[PDB]
Design a binder for this molecule. Structure first.
Ligand SMILES: [Mg+2]
Ligand SMILES: [Zn+2]
Ligand SMILES: [Zn+2]
Lengths: 1166, 50, 89, 53
């Protein structure tokens, strides 16, 4: 089979240095003139930056001179001026060149931080530049006379040396010299000699640099790049249409900055050739050569010499490097953003009538959006003669088009998105419902996922054009298909505010009301009793209900009974589907409980019933909340009657301590602490006063004299249910609010005595203002911090995707309840839920296996483990996964919007980063910067030192800067002595045995240590526990998984100890290494296998290392990455997400996983 | 100690180091250093606090 | 309309391959080479395909088989046509 | 010495050469005359240069 020649579907990409002949290969002509256009007839001057001959025809399929204007004549080169008549797009394609008179250095390889020409020649930068500017002479191929090869001389020195040695000695200067250097260089010889020298002398300083350099050399050799190519003989010119001269309004022209530069280069070059043909003196031609160097440099990358300015404008002209790099930090267009067709946006409204699987869309919007579909469908039925007439029809908006639109809309989903996109739920699919208006209607239950208020937030809409996109949206991005946050299995469809106030008001009981103590047959006549006004919504009543339990095998049991409940609960029970027990609705129904209802319902009945259930809950919530007549008046907020008294007493305390300071019984600062303490305590008192009052004060009579229950007051119900408001804010409404603190952070000792129900005076408000401003500023800052964090996270994970099914390793981490301090800051059941057991676990007695081997632990398994007393479960994690270059689904967990085990091919790194990043706005050393420090693995300010090795220790030597510590193992030797500064108070006992990783001092410790001394599981445990300590303290739920994948990406690199294949100290992928040692344990060398040591790299550091260079060019410094890759001739095979996103082909994950797989195996095979 | 770190000696020397500080790399001149230093904070033209 | 795809996800496990298979089938219907295997409710090919998955009458196996058969259904037609090309020798 | 920015490395490199005296100009011009007229005479001494004309 003939392989191929012409266009195929390409794989990978290659990058390297450019040959003069290769540069010419791209070039379809040499631009010989600085001229652009004729100045009258705007036609291009021949052989110029803009040209028809070299590049392409001005107008489609037409010659410049105008001889052949017909679409027939195509492959024809015109006799007058050769122009092959072809599409003008080719002028966007065909490149060019310029033959430079004097050699020129490529500024990217001169000025890159590790200067390439510099370290390749083992020559310093300042020397090379000094040579390039003709400031001094440099030797080349010195031979045996007096002098080195790389040695540098001066005018007089060169003269004297030449006088002594005429031949067998060589020196040049300028660019020609550096080129001569690079060309005369023999890499192989250097390889041999350097290997020898490496082998001879023993010093660290010597063989370190030695091995680094030989590695560099042989790499550059294997690349295929020859050093000469660092010096440009020929300069390629970019196609004219990529740097357009295109005109504007008012007969004004606008052109890019590349034209100014290129024109300069051409000018100075031609002038150099001219000065050569005139036999000018040395100084002149030298000045010209230097100027040419500067011009070319400014063209390539501007700002590394002089920062040349554009014509008549101060602002420095944008060079090719800036063209590539882009702006906004690192953003390459596939990053910052890209405009997209078939889209729209607008202000959003409520639409409670909507089912949760749909949403409202404006008529006009849907018309303009689906316009092509509308055309094709209009003429498919025959209502329109041709596409033209169809346009005329929809343009006139004839009455017949609306129905056709209703046709094309029906099963066709649309994508909705908000501005602050964090987690995947930031974009969700809905079924369009045509609505009269300009506003988008969005289902209330989803308002939590978007974090969208109704205060003028806008949403954007995208149309899933291709069939695959329709099915992707419907089976993945669909609202109903994600009911559960990917961070934790808890439902994100949880009812929000009005609805929960409705369900709260419904089920609740006042002491006495209509129909108190009566009995009813079923919920039907309970509701019938209520609506007729005979019975009150809340009253204690016994009613017969039929509840189901599916506890049989796949089968619903039915039982009936007389339940003691309320009218409202009875009415609400009608909604509750099937196998849910009545108990769930027999409570007060707070936001938490109303959530657990949906949860249990989902883990029992499945998806569909949970969906319809949730919908019904929303509808009834709204309806009964409406009927409730809940409102808020000025008298709804009740101030304690004892407030003024507390104020006065706490105010007596301040004058007590004041008198004490007057008499000197107490110091100033101690006084300050005292007064601040008494005021704080006062605030606590008033708070717990108004709380009790506003809470239980309702005093009502049933058949007797008195009794008292929880208040029916509005603001209380609101705060208690969880609809909105909280004890903190309610506290500020009735009782006094806090004490404020000046910007310094010094807390003022005169708190705000008044509240919002009362008036605040001038001072109090002024003092509050700072708190407000710092609030908005801090929050607006932490949004950005969160963004940056998520960015670093996705950059470090990304391409991690579920690939293999099961790696099959018994390995895993021990899962215990968190048990911090006092009782259980988080249970065992949550930590082990949805995960998979590494190995079977026992009962108190054994040979009875509850959970066999590796099995998904769902609610039933976890409750079965809860029945038994088992406190200990070993669980498989993504950090310990044996699979290389990915995670096996059997290792990850079940967690997803769906309860089933994680799918094959879903990209977990991304979702992990998103899950860690979404709550980051809700975070307050501690705090969010603490999290950032953790993932960066930064060594703290005042750390602690763990014991290096177990065994008895003692204090060695004396005081100079350190007092040495001598460790003494039981069997093995004791060379180990660590130098610990003695001015730091120690911990370790001079006479006691210390296990490795014990406390030899206090303070936090760097996780590098924990990894090295205490182990891998130990360090991952430290990271996860500390970060979870940060989040959980704020009330944020994040499963250990995501953190664990981030951790796995942190430790991806490790440094070898032993040898037998690769280099000694190389940091490398533990995937590569483990795959190579597992392969070397058998066959190959019998066992040569090399030991490594796991390394801990920070997230921002581990993000630096990526195989694909196109990926690195995205988020890193572009200028360096391109060069540093181009020298080694690095070949990017794609294989990752980011790269395939840039190149614009199907993502090697998700749906595309069936593609890249069926490809990847076809590659490197038969 | 400030004097102990001072590389200069006389007025001309100081003016040299100053003119070479403000406009470095180009050869200094007496009239140049004088004109510069006089035109920085002492010139009614190039300076004012109002 | 199909509110939740959970049933289809039950018929084929992967849930991405669900999208792929249902896509391929939906294409078989959309560019008409074929007709639905189950009553069309006015549901577009998008949903019809999913209904076909849920009924367990359509998946990767079935489709591959049908297509493989059709290749020979065409081979049978062009049997006398392509063997007439013996002029190759 | 080298501050980069070739305006300097030029400005200084040319500043080395000393200005000509009014007599030195005549010296140089005389040298020019000597050289040229030499090549002209050398051209006149070639038969082919004549026959060609
Ligand atoms: Mg808002
Ligand atoms: Zn022509
Ligand atoms: Zn695994």
């Amino acid at each position: 089979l003939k392989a191929q020649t012409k266009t195929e579907e390409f794989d990978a990409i290659k990058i390297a240095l450019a040959s003069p002949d290769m540069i010419r290969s791209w070039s379809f002509g040499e631009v010989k003139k600085p001229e652009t256009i004729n100045y009258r007839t705007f036609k291009p001057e021949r052989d110029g930056l803009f040209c028809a001959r070299i590049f392409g025809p001005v107008k489609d399929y037409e010659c410049l001179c105008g001889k052949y204007k017909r679409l027939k004549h195509r492959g024809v080169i015109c006799e007058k001026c050769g122009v092959e008549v072809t599409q003008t797009k080719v002028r966007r394609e065909r490149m060019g060149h310029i033959e430079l008179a004097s050699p020129t250095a490529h500024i990217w390889f001169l000025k890159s931080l590790p200067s390439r020409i510099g370290l390749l020649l083992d020559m310093p930068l300042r020397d090379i530049e000094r040579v390039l500017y003709f400031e001094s002479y440099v030797v080349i191929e010195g031979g045996m006379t007096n002098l080195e090869r790389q040695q540098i001389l001066t005018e007089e020195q060169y003269l004297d040396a030449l006088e002594e040695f005429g031949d067998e000695f060589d020196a040049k200067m300028g660019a020609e010299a550096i080129q001569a250097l690079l060309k005369s260089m023999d890499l192989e010889q250097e390889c041999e000699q350097l290997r020898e020298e490496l082998n001879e002398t023993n010093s660290e300083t010597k063989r370190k640099k030695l091995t680094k350099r030989i590695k560099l050399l042989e790499a550059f050799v294997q690349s295929g790049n020859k050093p000469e190519w660092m010096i440009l003989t020929v300069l390629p010119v970019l196609p004219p249409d990529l740097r357009p001269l295109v005109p504007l309004d008012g007969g004004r022209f606008a052109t890019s900055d590349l034209n100014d530069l290129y024109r300069r280069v051409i000018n100075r070059n031609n002038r150099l050739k001219r000065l050569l043909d005139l036999a000018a003196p040395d100084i002149i031609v030298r000045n010209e050569k230097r100027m040419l160097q500067e011009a070319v440099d400014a063209l390539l990358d501007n700002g590394r010499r002089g920062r040349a300015i554009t014509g008549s404008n101060k602002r420095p002209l944008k060079s090719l490097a800036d063209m590539i790099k882009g702006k906004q930090g690192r953003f390459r267009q596939n990053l910052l953003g890209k405009r997209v067709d078939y889209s729209g946006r607008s202000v959003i409204t409520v639409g409670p009538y909507l089912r949760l699987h749909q949403c409202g869309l404006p008529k006009k919007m849907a018309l303009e959006l689906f316009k092509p579909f509308i055309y094709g469908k209009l003429e498919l039925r025959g209502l329109a003669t041709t596409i033209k007439a169809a346009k005329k029809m929809v343009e006139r908006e004839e009455a017949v088009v609306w129905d056709i639109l209703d046709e094309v809309i029906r099963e066709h989903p649309v994508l909705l998105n908000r501005a602050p996109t964090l987690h995947r739920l930031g974009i969700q699919a809905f079924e369009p419902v045509l609505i009269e208006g300009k506003a988008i209607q969005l289902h209330p239950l989803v308002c939590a996922a978007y974090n969208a208020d109704f205060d003028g937030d806008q949403m954007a809409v995208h149309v899933p054009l291709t069939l695959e996109a329709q099915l992707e949206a419907r089976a993945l991005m669909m609202s109903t298909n994600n009911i559960l946050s990917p961070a934790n299995g808890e439902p994100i469809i949880v009812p929000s505010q009005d609805v929960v106030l409705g369900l709260y008001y419904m089920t609740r009981d006042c002491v006495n009301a209509k129909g108190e103590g009566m009995v009813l047959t079923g919920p039907k006549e309970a509701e019938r009793l209520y609506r007729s006004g005979l019975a009150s919504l809340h009253a204690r009543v016994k009613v017969r209900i039929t509840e189901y339990e599916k506890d049989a095998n796949g089968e619903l049991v039915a039982k009936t009974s007389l339940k003691d409940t309320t009218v409202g609960r009875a009415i609400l029970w009608m909604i509750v589907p099937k196998g849910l027990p009545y108990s769930i609705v027999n409570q007060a129904l707070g936001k938490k409980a109303i959530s657990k209802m949906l949860n249990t319902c989902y883990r029992i009945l499945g998806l569909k019933p949970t969906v319809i259930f949730a919908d019904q809950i929303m509808y009834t919530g709204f309806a009964y909340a409406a009927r409730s007549g809940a409102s808020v008046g000025i008298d709804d907020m009740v101030i304690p009657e004892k407030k003024h008294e507390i104020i006065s007493e706490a105010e007596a305390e301040v004058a007590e301590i004041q008198e004490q300071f007057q008499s000197g019984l107490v110091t100033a600062g101690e006084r300050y602490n005292k007064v601040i303490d008494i005021w704080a305590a006062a605030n606590d008192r008033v708070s717990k006063a108004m709380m009790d009052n506003l809470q239980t004060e309702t005093v009502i009579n049933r058949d007797g004299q008195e009794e008292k229950q929880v208040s029916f007051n509005s603001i209380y119900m609101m705060a208690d249910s969880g609809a909105r408001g909280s004890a903190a804010q309610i506290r500020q409404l009735a009782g006094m609010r806090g004490l404020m603190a000046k910007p310094d952070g010094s807390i003022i000792e005169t708190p705000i005595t008044a509240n919002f129900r009362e008036g605040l005076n001038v001072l109090q408000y002024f003092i509050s203002t700072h708190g407000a401003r710092k609030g908005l500023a801090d929050t607006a800052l932490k949004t950005a911090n969160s963004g940056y964090l998520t960015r670093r996270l996705v950059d470090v994970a990304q391409d991690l995707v579920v690939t293999e099914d099961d790696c099959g390793t018994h390995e895993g981490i021990m899962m215990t309840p968190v048990i911090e301090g006092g009782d259980v800051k988080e249970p065992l059941r949550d930590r082990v839920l949805g995960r998979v057991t590494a190995e079977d676990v026992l009962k108190p007695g054994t040979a009875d296996i509850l959970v066999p081997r590796n099995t998904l632990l769902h609610e039933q398994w976890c409750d079965l483990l809860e029945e038994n007393s088992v406190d200990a479960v070993k669980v498989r994690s993504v950090v310990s996964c044996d699979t290389d270059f990915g995670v096996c689904a059997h290792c990850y967990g079940r967690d997803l919007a769906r309860g089933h085990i994680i799918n094959k091919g879903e990209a977990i790194g991304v979702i992990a980063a998103q899950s860690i990043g979404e709550p980051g706005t809700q975070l307050t050393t501690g705090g969010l910067p603490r999290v950032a420090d953790l993932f960066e693995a930064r060594r703290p300010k005042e750390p602690a030192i763990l014991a290096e090795i177990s065994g008895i220790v003692s204090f060695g030597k004396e005081t100079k800067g350190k007092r040495r510590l001598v460790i003494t193992p039981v069997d093995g030797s004791d060379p180990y002595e660590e130098m610990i500064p003695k001015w730091r108070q120690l911990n370790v006992f001079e006479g006691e045995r210390v296990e490795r990783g014990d406390v030899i001092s206090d303070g936090p410790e760097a996780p590098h240590d924990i990894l090295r001394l205490r182990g891998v599981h130990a360090v991952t445990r430290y990271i996860v526990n500390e970060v979870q300590d940060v989040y959980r303290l704020q009330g944020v739920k994040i499963n250990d998984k995501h953190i664990e994948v981030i951790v796995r990406q942190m430790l991806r690199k490790a440094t070898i100890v032993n040898a037998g294949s690769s280099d000694f100290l190389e940091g490398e992928q533990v995937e590569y290494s483990r795959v190579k040692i597992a392969n070397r344990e058998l066959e190959a060398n019998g066992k040569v296998g090399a030991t490594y040591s796991r390394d801990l790299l920070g997230i921002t550091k581990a993000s630096l290392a990526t195989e694909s260079f196109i990926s690195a060019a995205s988020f890193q410094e572009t200028t360096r990455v391109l060069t540093e890759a181009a020298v080694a001739g690095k070949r990017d095979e794609l294989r990752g997400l980011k790269e395939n996103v840039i190149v614009g082909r199907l993502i090697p994950a998700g749906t595309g996983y069936a593609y890249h797989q069926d490809r990847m195996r076809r590659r490197a095979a038969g | 100690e400030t004097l102990r770190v001072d590389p200069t000696n006389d007025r001309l020397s100081a003016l040299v180091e100053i003119y070479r500080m403000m406009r470095p790399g180009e050869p200094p001149t007496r009239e140049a250093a004088e004109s510069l230093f006089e035109n920085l904070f002492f010139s009614e033209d190039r300076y004012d606090l109002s | 309309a199909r509110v939740t795809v959970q049933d289809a996800v039950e018929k084929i496990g992967n849930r991405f391959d669900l999208v792929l298979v249902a896509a391929r089938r939906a294409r078989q219907m959309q560019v008409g080479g074929k007709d639905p295997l189950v009553p069309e409710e006015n549901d577009k090919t998008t949903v019809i395909a999913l209904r076909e998955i849920e009924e367990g009458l359509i998946n990767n196996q079935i489709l591959d088989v049908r297509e493989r058969q059709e290749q020979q259904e065409q081979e049978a037609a062009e049997l006398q046509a392509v063997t007439a090309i013996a002029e190759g020798r | 010495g080298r501050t980069t920015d070739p305006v300097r490395m030029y400005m200084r490199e040319m500043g080395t050469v000393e200005l000509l005296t009014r007599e030195g100009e005549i010296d140089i011009a005389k040298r020019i005359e000597d050289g040229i007229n030499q090549v002209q005479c050398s051209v006149a001494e070639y038969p082919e240069a004549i026959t060609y004309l």
